[PDB]
Every structure is written in C-alpha cells, then in structure tokens.
C-alpha cells in the first residue's frame, strides 16, 4: 500500500520488483577423497620427504577424529535415542548435525569394505563399485602432477632436484589446505560447509567433482552462486589418509504472496542546497505486512532473489508511517559531494532536479526553468516531446496519474547525520540538555 | 614371470677375490633396486647394503664400508657384489632381493636362490 | 635397536594353537614391523607386512598384534607344513634395517 | 583556522599535511580475448571433451548478449537519440553509459571483419594489422600450456591420460571464471569493473596485458593501486567464442585549495585514570570549509591521497566548534586495555603522559614529576636537553609557541561509550527518562 | 558474579568457559630472499626480457630503500641515541621499530660478506655457512620452474615460445608480488607484518621456510593461525636484487586470574509473540571486573582464547546491573523471521518454549502444556526421564538449583529496534520530542 | 605436396582374402588420423572406422565388426585394409580418408584415388 | 539419423538459379552439417564446412541455409562445369557418421 | 680444460675466396654462442656477429652484410667462417672467441690465438 | 657510440701510480661498461667486468671508477709485467657492442 506518488516528490522513484525463493528438500551423494598420492613408479630416489608429509598430516587429521568420536559413541538406535547427560552442552543445530550424521553409518560401513581397492588407486578419477547397483567415486590430491611432470623427466634430470621439487609440491599443497581444515575448524559436526570450501582438499576443483556426480538441474548456477551445496564429514581414516563426504542438492521453492520493491534515490533542492532522502533502499511486502530485509546475503538477479535463509527484520512504526504518505517525518540529509545522481527515468517519465543540471526542450529549442518552490519537475511528453540533458537525445511517454503534480508542494522533515562520532557527539548533547531539564523540573 | 637366478657355489683360498651375480627377468630393471643380505653361520640374517639402479650409486652399511663393492651392467640386466681379503670368517651364504616401495611401507618381495662361498 | 625372540625352539601338537613373541630394544612405531617365514633349502618369504595386515596368498590363520616393545605371532592351528623359521623385522628407513633371531617349529 | 595548541592538551597531536587529487581525462584502447584454445597438434586422441566445453561455456556466456541487445536496439543516431518507452526504467549511470557503447560501434565493425584471421591463432600472444595505421592485440585462455607441456610428452605416456590431464585443466579455468563474469555479472552495460577483474579471462595476468599496450605514465603505479583503471564489453560472439573490450587510461589532477590534515591520539590522565579522545582523524579543509573523508576508499601516500571519486561528507556544528578550540564539545572514553600509545613526537618537541611512564633527563641525571593537575607535559631543550623513555635516547628541539604551556589548564567534555551493543542500551535509558518527565508535565 | 539462573528465564544459557591467554618473548632469526633467477643453462636465446625484469623490479624496490635511509642516517651508538630534531614526527611504535633495526646492524653486516657466494646460487635451497657456529638459508623465486620444466624441453621446441613462456612467468610473478609490496607499502620500519604475507615474495610456501628453520614448539599451530609470527625488513640490496628478512617466534602465556564465560540465546514468548534478549555473547571476566572484548580479532579454541593483543574495552553501568540480577533493565528485540533457535541443552538439564514446538513426554506418552504467564520451561528427569523434541529421543539429567522454577516469574524490559536508519529516526524523534518539552518549559 | 596412393583393381574368388594398401606423403604421418570409406553399387556412401596412427588401435562400426581388420607399418606410412572370406557382395569400391580437426568442426580434407574389388 | 534428399535428379539452363533440398529424421545442430560434391571418376571434396562457412577454393555463387530438420543448397547462376553429384553430411562424433543420399545435376 | 684452436695463416689473390675453421673443446658445445671479431691495421677492434649453436641461426652486423656467411658442424664441434669476392682491405686478423651470460652481465672469457689473412 | 681515450701513449717509473680516462658519446649505464687487456703476440683477456667489480684472477692493485659519460681506470703501483694494452668496451645488448681506440704504456 505504497504511496508512490508522495515517495516521488522527496526523491524515491520506483524501479523493478522481484520475487522471493528459498531452498528446501536436499538429497544426498556420497564421495571419497584420498589425500596422499602414489609415487610407485618413482620409489628409487623419494627420500625422506613422505614420512614427514605422513607426520604432519597426522597432526591435523586427528583432532576432527577426535571431535567427531563425540556424538558416535552416545547415540544409539532406540526415532534415535541420544544421551544428553554425557554430552552435557549442545545446541538444536549440533543435535539435528548428529542425528543426521547417525543417519549414514550404514553408507559409511558399506563404503569401508573396500579400503584395499581405496588404497591402491593411481589415477586422478576412479570409479569404484560398492554394490551392484550403487557406485562410489575416488578423488587423489597430486596424482596427475606427478603422473605427468615427474615421471616422464626423471631419466634426464638428478633425484636430487626431483626430491626438492616434490617436497615443494607437498609444502604448497599443505600450504593452501592449512586455511580450511586447521584450527579454524572447531565445530565439524555441523553442515553448513559449502562445496566451494571443501574443494580445497582437491585443490579447488569443485566444477570437475560437480560434472562427475552429474548434477541434472536448470538452476544449477542460482544454487551454484548462493551458496546453497553443502556437505559433511561423516569419516577420517588415521591408517589410510582418507576421508568420507555427504553432498547435499537441494531445491528452490517460490514463497506465494510475497515480493521486493526497490526504490531509486535522486537528489532535491529545498532552500538553497541538495539533500537526499535517507530510507531503507529494499521493501518485502508479504501478505500486508512490511519489513525490513538484509538483502547483503542473498543473491541478486533480474527477476528474482534467491536466498538460503528467511532475512526478515522488523521495522519501526514511523518507518511504516513515511512509506504511506506521511513525509512529513522522513529524514534527510545534506549533500557536499559533487558525485550524485540528479535525475532518473521510470516507464518513460523523467524526473529531473534542473536547478543543477541544464534543461531544455529540443522540439521547441527553449529551456526548462525550476522556481525555488519546487522540489523536482516531471517531465512528459504532454509539454515536451522529447528533451536533451546534456549530450543524450530522449524521448518520453505518458504520466499517468495526477495531471496537476507541478503544482502541488508538499512537507519535508528534519535533517540528520549518519557519522558514528557524529551519531556519539548527539547522543552526548542530548543526554545534556534532557539532565538540564530534569534539573529545572526538580 | 619375475625371476633372479645367481652364479653356483665356488671355493677360494684366504688372500684372493670373489665376484658374484644377481641377474633379473620378467620385469622393468630400471624401476626399483636391489639390496644384498648375508646369512652366517647359525642362520643370522644381515642387512649389507643397496644398489640404485638408475644413477649407479651404492650404498654400504657400518660393517661392510671397506672390503665390498658394488656395480652394474644394465645392457643384460646384471648386478655384480666383489670381496677381496677372503677369510674362514667370510664363509656364508649370500642373496640378493628386489625393493618394493608404493608410499606405505617398504618390503622385499622376490629373493634369489643364494649363493655359498667356502674360504680355506 | 636388537630385536629378541624368547622361544628358540617350540613343538606343537596338530590342531594345538601357538603364540610366539618378539621384544625390542627400545620403542618402535607399529607401522615398522614386518615378519618373514623360511624353510629348509629355500629363501625368506614375506608372512605379514605391518602389525596385523597379510601378505598376499598368506592364509587367513595367522594372527598377529603387538603395541610398544612386545608383539607377538599367533596361529589359531597349526598343520603339516608349518615346520618352517619365522623371524620379526624392523624397517624404518633405508640405514636401519634389523633382524631378528629366529625361532623353529616342530612338530609332535 | 584549527587550534593546535589547544588540541594538544587533549591528546591530538598534528601530523603530516597531504594534498587532493582525482583522476580525469580517459583515453580508450581496443583489445580481443579469445576464450578457446587450439588443439590442432594433438586433435587424435582428444576426446570429447572439447564439446562439453563449448556447451559449459555457451550457457554462460549467452546471458551478458541478452543483457546487452536490450541498448542496441533502440539507439540510433540522430547528439545520438534514444528510445526511453522501451527501455522503461534506467538511472542516470546507465544511460551515461549507453552513450558510450555506441561510440564505440564504428571500432568494432571494422575489427570484426578480421573473423577468419582471430580464430586460426595459436599462440598466447598474437598482433593483427587491422588497418595500415591500427592493429590489434588477440590473447588466448589456455595456448601457452598445451604448447609447451601436453605437445612434447604427447608420444612418452599413452594418451588415455593426456585426456584427463586436458579435462582436468579446463574445469580449474572454468572454476576461476564464474566469481566474476557468473550470475554476480547482473549489469554489463557499465564501465566501472577494473582491469584486475578482467585479467581473470586471461589467468589474472594484468601485468602482460598493460606491457604490450605500452603504458607511458610516470603515475601508473598509483593508478593501478587506486583502481583509476577499467574496462568495458562491448561485443560478445557465440559462435567462435571471443570478446571485445575497451580499457580507459585517465589523468591524474589536483584539487586546488585543499588539504589534508591528520592528528595522532595519545592517552591522558583527568581524575586517577586514562582517556581517549574521540575525533576523526583525517579533516578535510577546501577554501574555508571543513568536513569529513571516508579515507577507507583511497590510496594514502607519503605526500598526497589519490582517489577515484570526491567522498566529502558534511559535519555537525558541534564538533566544528570543538576543532577551532572549544575542548568542551569533544567526548572522550575511559581506558582499560594495556597497549595504547602513551608519548609523540611532533617538530622535535615530546608530548607524553608521566604518570603511566618513566621520565627523567639524561642531562641532569633526576626524574621529571607530573602533577595531578596535568593532563600532559611539553618537553623540549629549554628545559631538559637530552631525555629518556625507557632503553632509548632522544635529543629535542625548541617548542614555537606560549612560553607558559604547562602552567595553564583546560577544560573537558563527558564521557562517552561506543561499543555497538552499548548504543542500544543507552538509546533506551534516555527514552524512559524523557517519558516519565513528560507525564509529570501532563 | 553473574546470576545464571535470572538469566535463564530470560533466554540466555551458559555454555563453555575459557582461559585467556597472550603472545611474548619473541627470539630471532634471519633469512636471505632473492628475487631474481639464474639462466646460465638457457642463456643463448633468452632475449631482452631480463632486462626490463630488471627495469620493472629496480622501480618496485628503490622506495624501500628510501624509506629505510631514515633512521639509518639519525640513529647511532652513545642505550642508543637518535635525532629526534632530524626525525621531526614519528610515533611509540617507529621509534621502537627503529631500536629493533638498529639492533640488527652487526647481523646485516656478517651476512653482506657474502656477496659473491650469494650471487652465484642456482637452487631453490642452499645453505650458507656465515661463520663456523652459524649458518644463513637463501631461497630463490622461480629457480624451480627454470630447472625443472624449461631446461629439459629447450631442445625439443622452438626457443621462441621459451622466450614467451619465461616472460609469462616473470610477468605472473611480478602480478602476484605486487599486491604487498606496491605502494601499500607506507611505513616498513614497523614489525606487524605477519610471515605469511611476507611468503608472498617466495610464491606463498611459508611451509617450506618454517620447516627449513626447524620450528620446534607443540603451540606452533595456535601460534601460526593467531597471526603471532611477523617479520621485519633490515636491508635492500640494488645491485643483486636481495633482501634481508628477520622472524620473530613468540611464547604464549597465561593470563591469571581471568577467564571468559559463553551465553546460548532463545527466543521466549511474553504476549502473544517471540522476543530474543540482546546483550553480548562474550563476557570477560579477571579479577572481580567485567568488561567487553571484541573476540573478532582473537582465535576461538576449545579450552582458551589466544590473542596477540589485549582487547579489552568499558562496559556501561546499565549492562552491568542487568548481567548481576536486574533483569528489568535488560532490552529485547521481536522476532519475524522463521529460523530461530528454541531449544538449549545444559549439563543435562532442556530449555525449550514449547508454545511454538512440539513438548510430549515419551515415558508417560502425555503433551507437555505451557500457560501464557510463561517464558521457559525446565524439563529434568524428575517429571519427564526421557522427552521427545520432533525426531530426537533425549533423556535428561537432574537440575541443580530451585525446585520452584516453574513456579516464579520476573520482570521484562522495554523493546528495541537495531537497524542504522532506525537508529537514525528514534534520534530525530527524541531530538523533536525534547525541543518540544523544552518549548513548553520557557 | 600432400598426397596419397592406392593400390590398383584386383579381382578375387569367394573365399579368399584381400589386403588393400595406401601411402601417404607430404606431411607429418603421426599428426592425422586414417578414415576408410565405402561405396557400394548405387553410389551411395558408407563409413567403416578409423585407425590411430600414434597407437595403432582401430575402430569398426557395427555393419563392419567380424570381417574387417587395420594394421599400420610406420617405417614406410602405409596403412593397410584386409577382408577375410569375400562374398558377392563385397563388390564396391574403398577410399582412404584423412581426417582434419582443429576444435570447431571436422572434415576429410584429402581423399585417394580409390580401389576397385570384384569377387565373381 | 539417415538423411533423404528430395531431388533425385535436376536440369537446368545456363544462367537460371536452382536449389536442393536435405531434410532430417531427427533435430541437427547447425554446427554438425556439411556438404560434399563429386564429378564423374574421381573422389569426393568439401564444399561447404558448416551450415554456411564456405570452403578454401569454393566460388561465392553458392549458398547453404536451414536450420532445425530442413536444409537447403542455392546456386545463384550455373555454369557448364556445375555438372556434378552433391551430399549433405553430419557428423557429431566419431560413432555418429551419416552421408546423404546425393542429387545430380543436368544442364540442358 | 677449456680451449680453442683456429687454422694457420693464409695467402689469397684479390677475387678468391676464403674459409676459416675454429674447433672446440673441454666444454658443452651446444650451451653457447660463438662471436667473431676483426682486428684490422692500427690495432682496432671491431665485432662482426654471432652465430646460435643450438638452431645455427646468424647474425650479422651494419658493415658486414654483403660477402660473409658463418656456418657450423655440430658433429666435430667447428664452426666456420667464408669470405666471399676478397679485396685489399680484407688484409686483417680475426678471432673466434665465446659467450657468457648468467643473467647480470655479458663477457668473452675465452679467446682464439687468431689467424691472419693477406690480400695481394 | 663512440668511445674515446685520451692517454694515447703513456710512460712511467716502477712504484709510480697512473690514470688512463675513458669518455663517451652519450650516457652509459654504470652497468654496461668493461676493461679489457691485451699483450703483445696474444688475444685480449678480461680485467673489469664492471664499473668497480674485478676479474677473475686479476690482483687487486687495478682500480675503476667513474659515472655518467666520464669513466677512468687507476693503477696503484706498476710493476713489470704491466706492459699491456688497455680497452675501455660497452655492451648493452647484442647489437650494441663498441670497443674503445686503446692505451698503450711503457716503462721508464
Ligand atoms: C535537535 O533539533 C534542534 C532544532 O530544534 C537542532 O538545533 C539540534 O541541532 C538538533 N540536535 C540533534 C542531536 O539532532
Ligand atoms: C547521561 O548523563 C548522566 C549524568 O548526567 C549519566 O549518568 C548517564 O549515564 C548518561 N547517559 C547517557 C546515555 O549518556
């Protein structure tokens, strides 16, 4: 129940509206990542370098292991009974991460049958075959460096530059994964972790681990951006160096009743100065309700916004007042910058501060004149067919609405300032002058 | 199939040299390497030493730094183990066993069929 | 880093489990531990390769499990041809490469 | 016109005065990037995998076509008339730069003529003759790997590997390309993207692509840090993959009547404990004015600040009035941390708090004693030649100004808290007290 | 001193308790960096490109040095003395910077004996025997890639492309190092720059560095991922292109005395809505103070907090009367949105508002009831053994405190509002309001 | 130039077996591939398969699975075609092919001259 | 996916302009198709690469258009050398090969 | 050790032609170039070109563009130098020498003995 | 760029010390600039590599300096094998090479 027609005259000009999506019913996939390649081929001269990438990875890898012995040992099958008195502190989310992570121990027992096979992969890619209808996928960290660069040059070149270039490729690689899986990870039980995040254990390679698991969805890219693919651990091997990984797909639903309208700022000259009008710059309306919205993390596209949580932020009474018609009590501010928007163009009417700016009509070849009452002039092609602003030729529709906008004023509301210091220093003159008054009160 | 088959048995006097043979079937030469052991007298197993096989350089243990040496012939595939100042002391049997390594854990697969030298 | 096997001669009955042992000098990590069998007029031949994983074609009786300094070589039953010498081994790089004594099996 | 000497007694010593500039003046250059490489050597045993590439890649690269149609369409010359009906809803960035892609329509149809001769490259770097007096440069994604790694080992290891080496380095291209020309790409038509962004279709190499235009400013290395540089799309082909892109060089100019002012803080002693002051740190003063600068978006060098726009914000009366030397406006905050900054040096003279550090002269060998009276003490060589603070020796200078500092006093406003949580903490206590007073009124 | 169980009807949990813990006693090391690679073995045909590498990198490293010759000149030995005439403005932190630097003068001078040995190094790694007790490691940047992949290939391929591969590579290079050590570079004296951005300069492999230094502490993690290892620039060299770096490896102690307490929000019902309770999440506790602290810039772990700084700030009067009992003076915030937490664990013992979730017993299969003049309920073994929350099964523990729970309530505090053009609009009422009772006053 | 021979007109009983022959010139022989192409009484044309030349394996289609072989000589670029146990109506003509692809599209750049069979 | 050709066969006067026909069984991309000519007792060569790209060599007075399942060949003016057999080819693959059926073309 | 041997001298009537060898030794021939160097009447120097000893590409300076051509053997590591069409002004001594470069600077370190040409 | 040195011909006495100068064209980098030495019957060997740095071998009595256009070359005390010919050379690439005229010196 906008009042589009008030908004104008401060400075607020409508744009383009926009749906409102959320994911919802994920499904599941499963995968294995091998962390230690194979150098089978180029054992005679390695050196020593593998048995202390071995202990230093032992050394990140066991503190998840340990976090993650936590919730194994109290949960059971009775619908799953859990122990709260052993677990002592917990949330709902690290409760709904631990039923869901008993939900796949059957998986993760079928899947660990195979550890012989797992463990004698050479290839990059390996398709393994769990069950006769169920299939599983093996992912190597350096193999194919190593396949291709070391091996074929090893007979023109000394060990010892190849035993340098291999513990440099190993440093590098511990290097890029120290910033994920470290200390950084305390809570492992969770699944908020996005795909992009977990890829750093094959590199960042997560498009070519998207293409194998044969992703078959047409908002694939919306899901892709909004971060909206998780995954989860489920399984560390100590012995093996690898570990398990749950995939999560989910779905966009549309929410009925519900849309986003954004508004467009231009500044507006009142005594002799510009100001602009400071309001929040995205509206949801759902049902007849207005609130506020962080739009920051959400996705922004043409037609819609997609979001992987519900945003909503309350909103105060005089906020809903101003957006009705009541500009009467909508702040504003000064402008002191030369770099500000002074007109814009909606469903081919132009709304234009001409004080500063030139206007003239180029069908008739006169200018466009702005008394000092007037806040901004609506331009159409009722008076002038088509109009210059500069060195662009535009030409303009129809208004509809009221026929008389250019002569009615309206009420402007008091000026602020939005600096934090600015923001303490009123706060301090206002806390003054309310003790003076209470001391003439008393 | 992966086979090595060494030199017979042969009898020396104390003062002369000996040369021994490990020659390798079946199998890519060049990928892995080649260690020796000697068995003694009351059936001790000894570790000697090793061979790379693709630059040539041997490497000997604590006990064996003076009087032992290695080589190669690559063209038939042969590695050779020379001793000189044969002693009663030396008399022992010798084998020579093939390296295997994949990044978990090191083994000697394949062995010879050995080799006994007789010092008197 | 000595490696000592107590029993230097044993002799079993057929159906009769066996445990054999092997001590060490000092401590040694689980992952550099290997035994090896051998029998009259023939090479050593590889048994098992870590502290519990079997060699390839070793059959499924032999049970072995050790922590620290003590480890032992279990068989759940013995048979004809298990008259043979097993020795335990500890490999931790190229320079440290030891041997055990050696311990015989009989049979009644 | 600010009061330093007053200022001083507070905490807020002056430091290095900087100028004004902004950037101006573009000049336009034409490049072409070629997004496929060539596998004419090594096309036996590629694959497939080419044509998967091509469909990954067209879905991609079809929106930003669609999204630039839209100003094709209806801009036509006449000084270069527009249709504002059809477009419907535009700002006045969008238009400006609607103009802009039609300048540029003459240099593209003249390059595009050359189809035959861009797609047959095969090399990284290639310079094409399009006129006697005019060429153009063609970079390439990926060439410089396939011609240097995959060729020469193409006949050491069968191939079935070469394909997945080639697969696998596609899809880590494919990876990088989607945070900056994916979804988030919602508005081509502008030209405020950076060459930085840009160089990712390249590998992120920007280095090589300013080389061989043959930058000729002594200022490029602040231009570059300022992101004065940008590009824009002008031409978009689906059928041999490549881009057009038009890159602007602007000039460097400075602001006349102004400068930059800072002020370092330094903790004091008012009852038996330290304060802060809480003022901006960086003053802006142009002709006669004084306002703020959100220095966050600019370069700061040793003699000047370089910025891409004008960011002057306005500042209230009251903190305009406690700068030019009422020291009762201005807030100030209790200390409770250990690590804060207790002396300064300012024209050889030595500002600092005695009573929370160690001070005795070196000349005369005796402690120097600040009363509790003293917020600070002023030391230079009228009084004590060579002082100490610590395990460092200082020689000082000669202080210009009242001979008297220390024996005159000061006033000082009220305390203040400025933690986010606090704000709203106090916002509500004054509204309680204000109400209550209002109904004794009534 | 803080009142867990008032603050429990209110909806805040206590969760784990942490120690605090700071960085100190740093030792010292130094390394040798060179930035330029060695060709001797591909010398026919590498063209001009070594020297304009030369031209662009001379350009990047001349401002360094100048910025270093100033406390070179004005510091000597007389326990060191400055000029601080010369000096003119400097801080606390310059100034200790600049005893740092002087320290390392006799260090510098050892090591630049080796000119000769440093110039003629053609590994990645090589280690340098400055006197018979100590040793100096020189790293080089692109050495590896030169020896591995170039060499071997330079007689297979035209050396026209090596030409173009090796200005490619110089060329990435020098747009990875720009990003540090460009113009951002203002003020090297200081020591806050970490090690990991100094690594920047060797491809971003501090792995390999601190394993070469042989770093043997069990804090090493916690020390790494804290930012507590920086590194200082003592000397630039011109004419060989190398510079001098040193490392500081800090030990971290114990704060007495001190620990910090963790809160879990809940939403709560009052009227016939959700409300949560806004106050801080991180409460620091040392002596018998309370205090905030932003734990933003510190390193959550299971057991402590490790900073590399003390951060704590003031606390208004207000929070602390809430924090202690007085729950009548503590602000709220209405919910809107749909994804809140409603339940908490703690040590056994269920906080849930069962008015908008699920609350049956699963012993006796009977609803649990919340009335209307409820927030919370406790649920314990004593009345529910074994409750189900949806799809969990929980069994509980016995609660330590009043038996009455359930059977008293307490007071409330006013509502509030958090958004930034909120916050702006509350102001200006209040402004309007207090003008309007100070009208009515005269 | 580019270029390439075939063999000429043979003529065979049913039963026996023929091997075809094609050299080829003027170009690198290990950077292209080798098509084999039919045309059959009627003028119409059909598509057997193609030989790699850095491996040697072929690739049949599936009218031409059991009866049809490729083989390589590299020493002398010749590619050569056998059919076994010929019947009446193998009685066409064959062509060899050489395959042309860059990453946009493919294409038989160069043909022979062809070979005429007739089993009778 | 075979291809058929509607005219068997074509006779035309000098100067006059003719077109052929090529539909398709099932949906072509335009990328996958060419066109081949061939003359009495010699073999087959390109013609067109795609479904307009004309070849290395080929006079500008032939023109290829179509899209979906139907194709088309125009020739603006013939001359007497014109006397030739065409075929429309796809090929998406090395599996996916399928020729025409061919047209020939008369001149009165 | 390094070192290079030139022929021995010469005598040659105005409109002959001329060839001078320069061998190489104790050193990896293909890891660097070749210079020539001319040392007329009056003790002058002047440098001629260079010559790549891995593609055998020359190069040729501003006075010399006309009547000189190097050519190189890599099997017996020579190079040569021909002078075609000989005249009075021909009369000089010349050097092959070699060239260093590590990335910081340019040298000659080592030198022929010289070999000298007369014109009458 | 031409090279020009002053000292055409120069004598001196055992013990004595002696400056040869070395002017330029135009500006040359410090970097670019090289001595060589030549006896009689022999090929020219290096001295100088650079503006300050020596040779291989080459004692440290020789001396250079010099910046811009104007560069010189000192000799702390001669003695008697000192009897060489001196070049001043620039080389900034492999088309710009240019060797100096020479000094010559005697001993008294
Ligand atoms: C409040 O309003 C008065 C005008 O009535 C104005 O003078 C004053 O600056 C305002 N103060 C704040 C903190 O908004
Ligand atoms: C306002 O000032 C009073 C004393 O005058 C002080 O007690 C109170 O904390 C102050 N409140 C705010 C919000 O500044």
């Known amino acids: 129940i906008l009042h589009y027609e008030k908004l104008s005259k401060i400075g607020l000009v409508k744009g383009v509206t926009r749906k409102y999506k959320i994911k919802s019913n994920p ?22 370098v593998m048995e202390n990438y071995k202990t230093r ?60 096979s797992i463990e004698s992969t050479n290839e990059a890619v390996v398709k393994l075959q769990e069950t006769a209808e169920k299939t599983v996928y093996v992912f190597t960290a350096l193999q194919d460096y190593i396949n291709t660069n070391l091996v074929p040059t090893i007979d023109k070149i000394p060990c010892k530059q190849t035993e340098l270039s291999l513990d440099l490729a190993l440093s590098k690689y511990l290097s890029d994964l120290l910033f994920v899986f470290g200390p950084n990870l305390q809570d492992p039980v969770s699944n908020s972790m996005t795909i992009q995040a977990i890829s750093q254990a094959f590199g960042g390679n997560y498009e070519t681990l998207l293409r194998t698991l044969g992703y078959a969805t047409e908002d694939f890219d919306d899901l892709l951006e909004s971060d909206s693919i998780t995954g989860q651990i489920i399984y560390v091997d100590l012995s093996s160096y690898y570990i398990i990984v749950r995939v999560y797909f989910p779905i966009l639903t549309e929410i009925q009743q519900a849309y ?30 207005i609130s506020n919205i962080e739009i920051g993390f959400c996705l922004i596209t043409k037609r819609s916004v997609i979001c992987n949580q519900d945003y909503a932020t309350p909103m105060t009474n005089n906020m809903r007042e101003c957006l009705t018609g009541s500009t009467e009590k909508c702040p504003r501010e000064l402008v002191v910058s030369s770099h500000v928007p ?35 002039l609506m331009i159409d092609n009722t008076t002038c067919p088509t109009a210059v602003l500069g060195n662009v030729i535009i030409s303009l529709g129809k208004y509809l609405g009221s026929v008389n906008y250019n002569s009615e004023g309206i009420a402007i509301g008091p000026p602020v300032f939005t600096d934090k210091v600015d923001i303490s220093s009123q706060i301090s003159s206002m806390n003054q002058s309310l003790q003076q008054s209470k001391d003439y009160i008393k | 199939q992966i086979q090595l088959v060494q030199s017979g048995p042969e009898l020396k006097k104390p003062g002369e040299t000996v040369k021994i043979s490990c020659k390798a ?96 | 880093n000595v490696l000592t096997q107590s029993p230097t001669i044993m002799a079993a009955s057929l159906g009769q489990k066996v445990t054999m042992t092997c001590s060490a000098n000092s401590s ?20 098992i390769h870590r502290t519990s994983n079997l060699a390839s074609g070793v059959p499924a009786r032999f049970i072995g499990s050790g922590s620290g300094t003590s480890f032992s070589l279990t068989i759940s039953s013995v048979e004809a041809e298990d008259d043979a010498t097993y020795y335990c081994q500890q490999w931790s790089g190229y320079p440290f490469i030891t041997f055990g004594s050696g311990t015989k099996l009989e049979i009644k």
């Open chain 1, 27 to 48: 499904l599941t996939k499963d995968i294995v990542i091998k962390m230690i390649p194979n150098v089978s081929n180029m054992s005679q001269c390695t050196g020593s």
């Open chain 1, 57 to 116: 990875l032992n050394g990140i890898l066991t503190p998840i292991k340990g976090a993650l012995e936590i919730y194994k040992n109290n949960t059971h099958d009775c619908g799953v009974c859990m122990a709260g008195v052993a677990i002592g502190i917990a949330t709902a989310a690290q409760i709904t991460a631990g039923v869901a992570l008993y939900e796949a121990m059957k998986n993760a027992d079928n899947i660990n049958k195979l550890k012989s």
């Open chain 1, 260 to 289: 986003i309208q954004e508004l467009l700022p231009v500044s507006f000259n009142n005594d002799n100065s510009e100001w602009i009008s400071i309001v929040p710059n995205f509206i949801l309306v759902r049902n007849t309700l």
């Open chain 1, 342 to 376: 002074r007109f814009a163009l909606s469903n081919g009417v132009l709304f234009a501060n001409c004080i500063s700016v030139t206007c003239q009509c180029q069908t008739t070849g006169r200018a466009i004149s702005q008394s000092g009452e007037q806040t901004l």
């Open chain 2, 25 to 120: 079937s079946g199998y890519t030469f060049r990928n892995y390497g080649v260690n020796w052991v000697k068995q003694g007298p009351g059936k001790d197993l000894k570790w000697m030493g090793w061979i790379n096989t693709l630059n040539g350089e041997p490497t000997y243990a604590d006990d064996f730094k003076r009087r032992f040496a290695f080589s190669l012939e690559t063209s038939a595939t042969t590695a050779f183990l020379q001793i000189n100042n044969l002693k009663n002391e030396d008399t022992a049997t010798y084998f020579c066993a093939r390296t295997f390594y994949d990044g978990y854990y090191y083994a000697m697969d394949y062995w010879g069929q050995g080799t006994s030298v007789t010092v008197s």
């Open chain 3, 28 to 47: 040694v990590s689980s992952s550099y531990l290997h035994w090896y069998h051998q029998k009259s007029g023939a090479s050593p031949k590889p048994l």
